[PDB]
Scaffold this active site. Structure first.
Site, PDB file in Angstrom:
ATOM      1  N   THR A 192       0.840  -1.183   0.000  1.00  0.00           N
ATOM      2  CA  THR A 192       0.000   0.000   0.000  1.00  0.00           C
ATOM      3  C   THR A 192       0.891   1.256   0.000  1.00  0.00           C
ATOM      4  O   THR A 192       2.086   1.131   0.271  1.00  0.00           O
ATOM      5  CB  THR A 192      -0.912  -0.080   1.248  1.00  0.00           C
ATOM      6  N   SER A 205      -4.614  -2.992   1.402  1.00  0.00           N
ATOM      7  CA  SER A 205      -5.041  -1.637   1.729  1.00  0.00           C
ATOM      8  C   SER A 205      -5.304  -0.724   0.515  1.00  0.00           C
ATOM      9  O   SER A 205      -6.293  -0.982  -0.176  1.00  0.00           O
ATOM     10  CB  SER A 205      -3.949  -1.133   2.673  1.00  0.00           C
ATOM     11  N   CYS A 206      -4.525   0.327   0.151  1.00  0.00           N
ATOM     12  CA  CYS A 206      -4.790   1.164  -1.030  1.00  0.00           C
ATOM     13  C   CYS A 206      -4.498   0.448  -2.304  1.00  0.00           C
ATOM     14  O   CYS A 206      -4.984   0.927  -3.326  1.00  0.00           O
ATOM     15  CB  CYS A 206      -3.949   2.425  -1.194  1.00  0.00           C
ATOM     16  N   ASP A 257      -9.390  -5.618  12.204  1.00  0.00           N
ATOM     17  CA  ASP A 257      -8.583  -4.598  11.612  1.00  0.00           C
ATOM     18  C   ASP A 257      -8.915  -3.271  12.271  1.00  0.00           C
ATOM     19  O   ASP A 257     -10.066  -2.822  12.230  1.00  0.00           O
ATOM     20  CB  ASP A 257      -8.870  -4.571  10.130  1.00  0.00           C
ATOM     21  N   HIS A 276      -4.593  -5.354  10.650  1.00  0.00           N
ATOM     22  CA  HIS A 276      -4.586  -4.887   9.276  1.00  0.00           C
ATOM     23  C   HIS A 276      -3.531  -5.604   8.428  1.00  0.00           C
ATOM     24  O   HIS A 276      -3.744  -5.875   7.239  1.00  0.00           O
ATOM     25  CB  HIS A 276      -4.316  -3.408   9.261  1.00  0.00           C
ATOM     26  N   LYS A 277      -2.381  -5.934   9.014  1.00  0.00           N
ATOM     27  CA  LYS A 277      -1.304  -6.591   8.294  1.00  0.00           C
ATOM     28  C   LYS A 277      -1.395  -8.108   8.474  1.00  0.00           C
ATOM     29  O   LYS A 277      -0.577  -8.754   9.137  1.00  0.00           O
ATOM     30  CB  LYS A 277       0.023  -6.015   8.809  1.00  0.00           C
TER      31      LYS A 277
HETATM   32  O1  LIG Z   1      -2.919   1.752   3.339  1.00  0.00           O
HETATM   33  C1  LIG Z   1      -2.295   2.721   3.814  1.00  0.00           C
HETATM   34  C2  LIG Z   1      -2.908   4.034   3.878  1.00  0.00           C
HETATM   35  C3  LIG Z   1      -2.130   5.154   4.219  1.00  0.00           C
HETATM   36  C4  LIG Z   1      -2.739   6.407   4.279  1.00  0.00           C
HETATM   37  C5  LIG Z   1      -4.131   6.539   3.995  1.00  0.00           C
HETATM   38  O2  LIG Z   1      -4.715   7.808   4.078  1.00  0.00           O
HETATM   39  C6  LIG Z   1      -4.896   5.394   3.652  1.00  0.00           C
HETATM   40  C7  LIG Z   1      -4.285   4.148   3.595  1.00  0.00           C
HETATM   41  O1  LIG Z   2      -7.078   8.354   7.550  1.00  0.00           O
HETATM   42  C1  LIG Z   2      -5.908   8.035   7.301  1.00  0.00           C
HETATM   43  C2  LIG Z   2      -5.426   6.667   7.043  1.00  0.00           C
HETATM   44  C3  LIG Z   2      -4.064   6.380   7.225  1.00  0.00           C
HETATM   45  C4  LIG Z   2      -3.557   5.087   6.993  1.00  0.00           C
HETATM   46  C5  LIG Z   2      -4.405   4.035   6.571  1.00  0.00           C
HETATM   47  O2  LIG Z   2      -3.821   2.771   6.358  1.00  0.00           O
HETATM   48  C6  LIG Z   2      -5.799   4.331   6.387  1.00  0.00           C
HETATM   49  C7  LIG Z   2      -6.297   5.629   6.621  1.00  0.00           C
END
Ligand SMILES: O=Cc1ccc(O)cc1
Ligand SMILES: O=Cc1ccc(O)cc1
Ligand SMILES: O=Cc1ccc(O)cc1
Ligand SMILES: O=Cc1ccc(O)cc1
Ligand SMILES: O=Cc1ccc(O)cc1
Ligand SMILES: O=Cc1ccc(O)cc1
Ligand SMILES: O=Cc1ccc(O)cc1
Ligand SMILES: O=Cc1ccc(O)cc1
Lengths: 258, 262, 262, 258
Positions: free
Chosen positions: C15, C84-85, C212, C240-241
């Protein structure tokens, strides 16, 4: 008459020093003047081999524009290759820019690739005479060609009519540079919304011995400026050989675009 | 009865923070006379690529000059012209390459001697001009733990004290390429004194103006008294940067030095 | 009646802010099963040499994946696992290389759809977890003048929300190699929606845990409802991980995906 | 017992990540731990080609020590090549250093050149197997050789007994590095006043498959440490394979040199 904030942008291999005569001239008329060294140019501490594109090379200009106080506008004056720095900056900060002024400069467009006028220049002036070339690989694997401009080329083509004191200064502080031509070939074209929209004034002389009359007239035909001023005589470095003429044209540009 | 006129090879050495660019008017003037001129950037000065924090002494800072003198052809000799702090570069060079040096010319310059510590004229300079106005100072620790003081010369001090009478194009150029510098005064203080056989033996010409607003008349006159030059030339007028405000006077005096020693 | 057991080529996509290093335990586990595993750093992530301010969109950020998929041998297909992303990386890839993708596996991941704008699940994520605690935010202007928000994830958020149940050696490693990242949310918002023919057509497996602490149960359950996965696997426990807290469970589920789609 | 501030220094090509198991171990005993990336190592943003010497490579350590509050002392722990970083730092900041700990590391001396133990290592282990080499010219013209460590070498020689999870991490984040051997050859020797004076503890294992027993015993003979601790078994990366042993020796060093 209108006083303005001008940001002066030297060409590859040179530095803010090329404006040492024009900056006091403009300040005598009440203008605020910023002369910037681009990455690895003038006394900038970076070496050219750590720069990976022309947009990274432009970083001193983009940081400066990023910090300009809200509501201020500048006139960016660019010589020779610095027309590509004006186009890159104008795409990112169009509303901070009162006008772009091209001084015996590349005049990029929005229709062809970013490297298009570089192709054209090199077609008009294919031999850099005693210039030396070198290459390095950039962080993404592309081979970048750098050059060290030859002193014959410097004396006869770039600094043709400059005093001996000016030509000697040029040799004492000139650095390596790069067109990043192949990375420019790969770059998205300049946008109509940003660069395409700014006011554009083109200053040149037919006595330029490196951006030859035919290439300069081709550029004007290819992307017609709002205003073209032709200075009689001088050489490629009109900010050295026709300093008061350029200061006078730039007063007109401040009057017209404020 | 017999007139000697000589062409010579001058090596021009800028002062700390500056670079070879300061000689951009005197170098053509000398070449008009038919001389050979080399103008060198010292370490971390002009467009030399090193940063000042990688330099550990005034001797290391002098490397471009010593390397150059190392490479001179056999039996070739040069006249080294040093401005302001560069008289210490001339002394460091003469203690390694005395037979390659026809004369040392001090131009509104520090005039080291062999009797006192290498930092002695630096101390007297600072005692005479102690307020550097808007200059900013910085520190780094060198290779053996010494703290080295560097400075970024202020622009008012540059306008009024160093470049007093220079044109605006010249003063603007200075501001455009000026870099950090260091006197390395504490390391000069621990350094062996200059030798009689090397530096003590070279011919030494002192060019100065009493209109200098940073190396003041009383300091310059004291230097001359402290260590008698073989010849002294006082230029009327100008400012600290006589190679910019009195370029032709300086070139003519240097023709006379070539006639006498080269 | 007939059992199929398949070995597959998984491409593991980290991510934002993270790198290929997050897969350092799941990659050996998969290779023990005989699979081929590629773990890529995306632009400006892990030890990729670009800085995030040189990147202008989430599509540019995805270049290492698209370049990799471009080079795959003719008729070779991969299973892309994104955490994640990284579900947006899977959607960007599937719209260029649909025939090279056997399935997309979303691991506590954003599940883009074709109906709404590309930034839609990003907006709903932020609406569900709006306080990033000690995260610091920064800005740069990209190539066409858009301001891009980047962040340096805070260490408490890292300890408690992302790496909740990870060992200390794992949490310390995260702190040692974590980089800046960006959602490029405003540029995703102006982006063409993902296509039905590319992304809409790939097989999609959703792995998640209700423990998570950052992609919360209500957001994950909403994603599943918003865009029905072909299969859902809910791991009990972990954090989460899951590739670090439930490495073997995850490898076994991925064996089942290979059996079904590879 | 005494709690101390340890500064951990990875070797060339690696980064602060190599200490991810040792840093929590030491923090469980009350110590303050700083693990630094050297220039162009770990996630440091510089590329190795812009680094011109081993002293420039050490800059993260020297900046850190430059800023250490007045009166604080640290124990610098260095693995493999990082013994040269301990010697460079100790010459500049001898009074901020409670002791240097060498973990299967080069142990420089004051008598021979800075490159001397590098010469010796390469004589003991002349083939880096599948390692690849490259060169660039540094800003003063010297040719610098860099390397990308081979993965067979990584598995069998460096990470011999490490878990598969650790070896895989190593491959995911390893970077290019350089010994700057020729620039070290030219460097003034380490001083007796600085480096020569600090306390020195040498940790090693005879099961190391790259700093072989004979080279390690040669080093100890050549410049006898204040204390030598030999750990049984493990491999070159004892901070991964014998993490609690190293944390225990380091507690003794905090007790002894505070
Ligand atoms: O998956 C990691 C992550 C980091 C920052 C974010 O705002 C959202 C997700
Ligand atoms: O809202 C921020 C955020 C940061 C990291 C993540 O993994 C998800 C969301
Ligand atoms: O203006 C400087 C310049 C230098 C080299 C080129 O090839 C083109 C322009
Ligand atoms: O063709 C090379 C070239 C060099 C310098 C210039 O200013 C223009 C072109
Ligand atoms: O000659 C330049 C100079 C600069 C700083 C000093 O302190 C002394 C001299
Ligand atoms: O005292 C500071 C000083 C600065 C510049 C000079 O040229 C001489 C002295
Ligand atoms: O410790 C890492 C190392 C790498 C390459 C060498 O040549 C010597 C040491
Ligand atoms: O000889 C090369 C070499 C590589 C890595 C090491 O750790 C030691 C030596």
């Amino acid at each position: 008459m209108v006083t303005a904030h001008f940001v002066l942008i030297h060409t590859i291999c040179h530095g803010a020093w090329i404006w040492h005569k024009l900056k006091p001239a403009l300040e005598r008329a009440g203008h605020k003047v910023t002369a910037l060294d681009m990455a690895a140019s003038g006394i900038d501490p970076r070496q050219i081999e750590q720069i990976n594109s022309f947009d990274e090379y432009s970083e001193p200009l983009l940081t400066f524009l990023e910090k300009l106080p809200q509501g201020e506008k500048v006139i960016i004056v660019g010589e020779s290759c610095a027309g590509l720095n004006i186009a890159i900056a104008a795409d990112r900060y169009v509303d901070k820019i009162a006008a772009g002024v091209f001084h015996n400069s590349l005049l990029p467009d929005t229709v062809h690739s970013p490297s298009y006028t570089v192709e054209k220049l090199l077609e008009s002036f294919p031999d850099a005479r005693d210039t030396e070339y070198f290459t390095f690989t950039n962080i993404t694997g592309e081979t970048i060609t750098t050059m060290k401009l030859g002193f014959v080329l410097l004396r006869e083509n770039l600094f043709t009519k400059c005093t001996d004191g000016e030509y000697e200064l040029a040799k004492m502080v000139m650095r390596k540079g790069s067109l990043f031509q192949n990375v420019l070939a790969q770059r998205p074209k300049f946008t109509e919304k940003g660069y395409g929209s700014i006011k554009k004034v083109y200053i040149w002389t037919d006595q330029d011995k490196i951006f030859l009359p035919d290439f300069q007239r081709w550029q004007i035909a290819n992307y017609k400026p709002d205003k073209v001023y032709q200075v009689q005589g001088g050489d490629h470095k009109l900010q050295l050989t026709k300093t008061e003429e350029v200061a006078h044209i730039l007063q007109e540009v401040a009057d017209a675009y404020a």
